[PDB]
Amino acid sequence: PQITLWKRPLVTIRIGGQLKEALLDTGADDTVLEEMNLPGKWKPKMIGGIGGFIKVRQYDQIPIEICGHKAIGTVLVGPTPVNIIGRNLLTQIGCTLNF
Amino acid sequence: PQITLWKRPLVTIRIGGQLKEALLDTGADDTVLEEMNLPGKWKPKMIGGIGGFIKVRQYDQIPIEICGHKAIGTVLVGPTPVNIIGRNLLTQIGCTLNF
Ligand SMILES: CCC(CC)CN(C[C@@H](O)[C@H](Cc1ccccc1)NC(=O)O[C@H]1CO[C@H]2OCC[C@H]21)S(=O)(=O)c1ccc2ncsc2c1
Secondary structure (H helix, E strand, C coil), rough: CCECCCCEEEEEEEEECCCEEECCCCCCCCCCCCCCCCCCCCCCEEEECCEEEEEEEEEEEEEEECCEEEEEEEEEECCCCCCCHHHHHCCCCCCCCEC | CCCCCCCEEEEEEEEEEEEEEEEECCCCCCEEEEEEEECCCCCEEEEEEEEEEEEEEEEEEEEEEEEEEEEEEEEECCCCEEEEEEEEHHHHCEEECCC
16 A cells, blocks of 8 residues: 555554554664564564663564565564564565655 | 665755754654754653653754755754654655555
8 A cells, every 4th residue: 555644654463363553663673562472482682762772572583464464574572662563574565665 | 766675764854954864754753853953942842762751852843855855844853863754744745655
């Protein structure tokens, strides 16, 4: 689809078998989801945002279906203000900015 | 133009007579610029992201050129690590997400 920006670009995603709402975030390098359980091994990591650094759990090679499009990649889980889809997965679904 | 998301979508902007690099950021409601001593009235604001909140100064009706496209609106100035063009200006320059 083409998505305009007068509203937040929120979309439904499917991950670990569950549906969630997430924000398409071109300013995020990484995909970061609010606290949730995911299967398999994870690694402790830290990432920084506008307000400082947080601790996250890094899960690699995780399938997510974003607005009907498949991605498989790194998902960070931790105290983000909102679920965000970052560039690591936006690239997989062929997302570009256009003006 | 079309901007892919393999790298950060940094573009050149001009504001208050300075040229800067800034993110075209669909995850940002508002535009947030690195500390700069702009003239005019402002209002204090707090904005939240990963890590917590920062304190910013809200300036209204500031002209800003983004990749050659003129815009005018609210800009928040404070200790962000990156200049961020948010949806309030992205809409003015006709920017969409496409996949
Ligand atoms: C609430 C939704 C997100 C935070 C999740 C909002 N951010 C915009 C992001 O695009 C931000 C923009 C950003 C970019 C770089 C540094 C700081 C902020 N990116 C960001 O936090 O990305 C993190 C995940 O991937 C990593 O790559 C970049 C930082 C990490 S923000 O910068 O905090 C932000 C910007 C404008 C704004 N207007 C009103 S509240 C508000 C908050």
